Each structure stands twice: as C-alpha cells, then as structure tokens.
Amino acid sequence: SKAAADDFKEAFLLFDRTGDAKITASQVGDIARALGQNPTNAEINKILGNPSKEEMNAAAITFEEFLPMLQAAANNKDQGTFEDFVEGLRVFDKEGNGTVMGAELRHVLATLGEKMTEEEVEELMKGQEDSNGCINYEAFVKHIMSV
Amino acid sequence: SKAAADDFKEAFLLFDRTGDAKITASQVGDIARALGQNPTNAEINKILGNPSKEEMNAAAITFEEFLPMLQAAANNKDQGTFEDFVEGLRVFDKEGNGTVMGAELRHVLATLGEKMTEEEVEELMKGQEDSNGCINYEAFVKHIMSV
Amino acid sequence: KLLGGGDVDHTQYAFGHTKVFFKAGLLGLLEEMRDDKLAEIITATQARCRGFLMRVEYRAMVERRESIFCIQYNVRSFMNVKHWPWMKLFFKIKPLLK
Amino acid sequence: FDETEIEDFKEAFTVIDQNADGIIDKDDLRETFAAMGRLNVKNEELDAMIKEASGPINFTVFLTMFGEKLKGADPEDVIMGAFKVLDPDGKGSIKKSFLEELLTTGGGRFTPEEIKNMWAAFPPDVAGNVDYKNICYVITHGEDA
Amino acid sequence: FDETEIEDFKEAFTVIDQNADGIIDKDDLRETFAAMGRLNVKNEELDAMIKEASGPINFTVFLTMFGEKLKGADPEDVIMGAFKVLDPDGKGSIKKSFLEELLTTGGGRFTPEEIKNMWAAFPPDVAGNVDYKNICYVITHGEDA
C-alpha cells in the first residue's frame, strides 16, 4: 500500500542477477519468503498454474506481476500460529520435556510432505541440537521464528 | 567462392615449412581440420587413392589442388550432428547421468576404429575428467565442439 | 566388453550365463548389413574424433611455442659462457655473496 | 634481465673491481684471479677479456657484454616452469627418448647432434631427460656442482 | 585504508619520487624504472600513468588514485580470517568444488566464468580451494612469488 514499502523493489534488485529488473518465476517462492512471507511450496505452485503460468519453461519477470503476487500471498500469513508448531512437536515425543531425538526430526523434515534437502535440515539443527542427540524444540522453534 | 576466403591461402603459408607455397599430402588431412572441416582419416585416404595419388611416396602441393580438395570435403560437414555424439556416449554408460569411467573412453578412443594415440587421448580428457574417474560427456562434448 | 568394438550387428548375438548366442545364415546376413551401417555411423564418428584429436594438438603445439625458445636460447648461452673467464669467476664468486 | 640478476652482476663487478673506482682494469682481473688461487694467470688471458670490449669495463659495458653473450639465458625458476609443463603430473624426471623426440620435432634447435652434446656433459639422467633440476642449476651456474 | 598500508604507499611514493619535492613527474617515473632495470621504458607508458590523474602526482593524488582502483583491496590477515571461517577446524585447505558452489550460491560475484578466471592464474590448489594462503599473498602483492 506503501504504507508504500519501496524496499521490496530494492530487494528485487538484489535477487535479479542480470540487472534488467526481472526475476524468474523459480525465484519468486524464495523471495516471498525473504520479504517476510511463508507460502507453502504447493501454494506457490498452484497459484502459478492457476494463472496458466508454467514454471517448467523459461520465465522472466516484471515487478508489476511480482508485487501483486506478494500481496496475494500476504493474506495467508494468518496461518503462522506458533501454538500449533510447538504442539505438533510436543505430540511427536513422549514425556514432559520438549526434546526430539535427532534423526526423528531430520528424517521427518526431509521425507514427510514438502521435501526439505538433508543439507537444509542439517543447517536448521546446527547449534540447537547438542551431542546428546536431543533437540529442544522450545528453543528450536523460538530460533526458527527469530528469522 | 570467396565469399572468397583468402585466409585459407594465408593459413597454407603457416603450414608450409619451406615457404615455397606447397603443402605435402600428409599435411592435408590436418589442415582441412584446421580450416574448419572434419573429414575422417579413411575418407582423406580414399579420396587421395581415388585420384591415383600415393601418400606413400614423396608429395608436394600446390594451392590449386588443395583448394578443390577442401571444397570437396566441405560438403561432408552435414555429417557433424551433436545429437548422435551425445547419444553415442549416453548408450555407453548406465544410469541417468552423463559420465564415462576414465579408462573406458581412453581405451575406446585409442583402439576402436581410427586409432587415436594415447597422447592425444590424454590431451582431450585433461581438465574435463577430475579425480573421481568420471568424465561428464555433456560438458566434454560441448568443449570438444568449442574448437 | 569385447563385443564393444567392431562394425558388427549388435543384434545378431545374445548373451547368457554360460555363453553367447549368435546367428548365422540369415542373422548372419543381418549383421553384415549392420556392419556396413556402422562404418557409416562409425566412419563418420571416427573422423570428427580424429579431427578433434589433432585439433587439441595444435592448442598444445602453440602453447609450447615460446617455452621452447626460452629453453632453446637459454641453453645455448651457457654453452658459450661456461668457457668465459669472467663467467667462471662470477661462478666461484657467486657464493660468497648474499 | 631481472633486477636481482643485475644486482648479482653488480656484486660480481665489485668483487673483480678491487680498486672500487667503477672500471675493471687488467690489474683488477689479475688480483681477483690471484685471490681465487691463480698465481700463474697469464697476461694474455687478461688481454683477451679486455679485447671483448670496445672500451673500459665499467658497469654498463660489463652488462652489455654479458647481455650479448647470454641472449638465451634463463633463470632456474623458468627452466623448472618449462620442465613442470613437460612433466605435468609432477615429481618424475621425464624419459630420455621423449626429450630427444620433442626437441627435434618441434624445433630446429632441438636437432639430434646437439642432443648428443646435451647428453655429453649433462650427464645421463640430465641427458636422458629423467632427472631434472640439476640441468637448471648448471645452466644458470656452470660447471659440475 | 589502515595506517600501515598508507605508510607503505608513502614509502613507495618516496622511492618513485627521486627528486624528493613531493610530486612525481614523468622523469621520476622513468628514473625509477631505469633503476629497476627498465632501459627501454617508453614515454607513452609514462604518459599513460600521468593520464590517470587530473593533476600532478602528489601524495594525496597518488592515494586517491590507488583508492579508486583498490575499492575491494583486502589485507592478508582479513583474507586469512575469512578462509579460517571457511575452514573452521584449522590447517586444511578447503575443497575445489566447495569454493565454487559457495561463491556462486551466495553471491553474484562468485558466478562460475569468474571462477574459471580464478583458477586460471591462481593455480590448482589456489583455484581448487585446497591450499590457502598463497592466494592471500598474491591478492595483497601480485605476480608469482
């Protein structure tokens, strides 16, 4: 709305590697996340196809399509409730203390639903899981929502 | 035709070591390749013999024979299709990734058909094959068609 | 692995646990046709290679161009010099230096 | 001529010019040879060294005389550069017949007869093309080390 | 610009300004090159160095010209700082493919083509990303050491 945030246009100049002021359709998922929006990858996929837009063939972009797609994704930020994120992992391990065994969270984050690479899974556990093999998800989900 | 390319005559002065403006019949194969023509060595051999020309005895040349032999070889450049070069090596190794094991390509290029020396085989693999012993022929055939 | 080479019909045969199977005189006929067809396919694929093979030789020959010269001239010097008073002198003396 | 090689010739010029006036005369040649152990150095050897110059041996006349005799002189690091390109896998001294074929077949300076003279004081390994490195030493500083 | 780097440029300014008046003219450039061994230094090379300035080469004009060409110049201790963070376990030179992937995937300055130029004079180890340290040397002081 501007509140006209012109820093979204300045961040589009940091993600366009050619400097022509266009951003390919394959970068739009990760740049919506870097502007403070977490649409799921199936949602980013649907919307695209919904608009008869094929992410399979070469793509370019213009700021005039990327701005309204970020504004259509911005209504879905009401789905980001931290009660359900901590209660999900509280149902994932027994006893009254928030600890996932290391390999349980790593294999679930790579193979269940939207596949996260094991390189990204190791980069999200690095520091929050110590050598006991127990990830405290009270501080883990706190630090994941700090970015 | 000239398009009269007079640089073919200037390249004949770079390959004639005596400066008399003649190039021996044994150099004509490699100089057709250096002018942008890839006739196979049996083809260069046949044509020669076809014309009752013996590459076994001393030979000289004149520009007036080398020009029409380069123009007779220039029609055969329609045989250089890169689909069949990459599909040849794709049938040469299993799995869905373009990698020949090092020694498979080296022994096939030296002993199968027109014998390439192992010195030339090592000079064609140098840089494209790393220490894993796997030659990626997608980039290997790309760089071989860059010259 | 062997059958890898040859301008032969890669059809006409068939392998199995204890032996290869081979056609003649029909399958024999087939192969033959096939054989010719690879000379084509092959003969043409050879060429480029051959071509290309030498094309890399030129890139090396050329690189080498000067490194030789350097080597070339460089030696010659010495052959001339090594017999020169002044140079022997420098030689015995070259060490006392720092 | 790299600048450290010119500083080495300036230090050799100062050790032969024992009068320190900037011009090496025949007395400096004889007194430098006598300080190296040459008690019998003839005057005809000193006259043949001075007969290679058109004037007195000052620093620039000594540099131009050495320049004109060393027109293909190569420092040890550039000779080992070229021998590392001839042995691109490192460590190994290259074969005798490979250096004989590549000297001849590339250039006229690598003709055989000259290759027999290369083997002739540059011993076997050196001559053969197997060792390496001792030949770079004796091309920058002559005689057996 | 750290102050010891500015004192190094003040010492280089005094070695090229052999008249010691504070302004490097074309005669100072030619006499510094002749004292390094350049007897054939053309006047067009001296004119191209003076054509990079809008005025006489005093100490602040030499510092602003070097500042504008070295806008990403990094001292050896900060380059080794960043390479110790890339190899956080110490001692080991980092892999060739790890530096190619991390240069590209983080930044546009680490794009490949540029990575082929990095391997191209920064040799293998350096290029590969295995050794380390020789590249910090040649980024603060160029040419082969």
DSSP assignment of E22-58 equals S-B-HHHHHHHHHHTT-SS--HHHHHHHHTT-SS-B-
Degrees to nearest 5, angle at CA D122 with D71 and C72: 30
> Is E47 annotated as contributing to ligand binding?
no
- Bridge-based pairing of strands C19-22 and C13-16 is antiparallel
10 Å CB burial of residue E60 (0-12, 13-18, 19+) is exposed
Q: Cβ–Cβ of C67/D11 closer than 8 Å?
A: no
CB E28 within 8 A of CB E16: yes
Amino acid at C67: S
Taking alpha carbons only, the member of B123, B97, B99, B98 closest to residue B110 is B123
Q: Which residues of D are less than 8 Å from E37 in CB distance?
A: 1-3, 6
Contact C68 D109 (CB under 8 A): yes
To test the contact with chain B by mutation, choose from C3, C37, C53 the residue with the greatest count of B C-beta atoms within 10 A, namely: C53
Distance in Å, alpha carbon of D13 to nearest chain E alpha carbon: 16
Give me the phi and psi of C26, to 5 degrees please: -90, -60
Chain B residues inside the 8 Å CB shell of C59: 147
What DSSP state is assigned to residue D95? P
Q: Is the CB of residue B128 less than 8 Å away from at least one CB of chain C?
A: no
**CA pair distance B143, C59, nearest whole angstrom:** 13
Q: Do B113 and C46 touch (CB under 8 A)?
A: yes
Q: How far apart are CA B30 and CA D83, in angstroms?
A: 28
Instruction: Determine whether B54 is exposed, middle or buried from the number of CB atoms within 10 Å of its CB (0-12, 13-18, 19+).
Output: exposed
With contact defined as beta carbons under 8 Å apart, do D85 and C67 qualify?
A: yes
Chain B CB contacts of C11 under 8 Å are none
D106, D111, D112, D116 alpha-carbon torsion, rounded to 10°: -110
DSSP state of C19: E
CA–CA distance, B91 with C41 (Å, rounded to integer): 14
Q: What is the CA radius of gyration of chain E?
A: 19
Find chain D residues with C-beta within 8 A of C71's C-beta.
74, 79, 82
N-to-C CA span, chain C:
64
Q: Is C55 on the interface with B (CB under 8 A)?
A: yes
Residue pointed to by tokens 């001559």: D127
User: Among B11, B117, B8, B16, which Cα is nearest to B59's?
Assistant: B16
| Nearest residue of chain D to residue C61 (CA atoms) | D106
Give all chains having 3 or more CB-to-CB distances under 8 Å with chain C: B, D
- Experimental approach was cryo-EM
According to DSSP, the residues that pair with E57 across neighbouring strands are E24
Establish whether chain D is in contact with chain C, requiring a minimum of 3 CB pairs below 8 angstroms.
Answer: yes
Please, are residues A129 and A138 in contact by the beta-carbon 8 Å criterion?
A: no
Checking phi first, is residue E68 left (phi over 0); if not, alpha (psi -120 to 50) or beta?
alpha
Say yes or no for a CB contact (<8 Å) between D82 and C67. yes
- Report the greatest alpha carbon distance in chain C: 88
Chain B residues within an 8 Å CB radius of C60 = 123
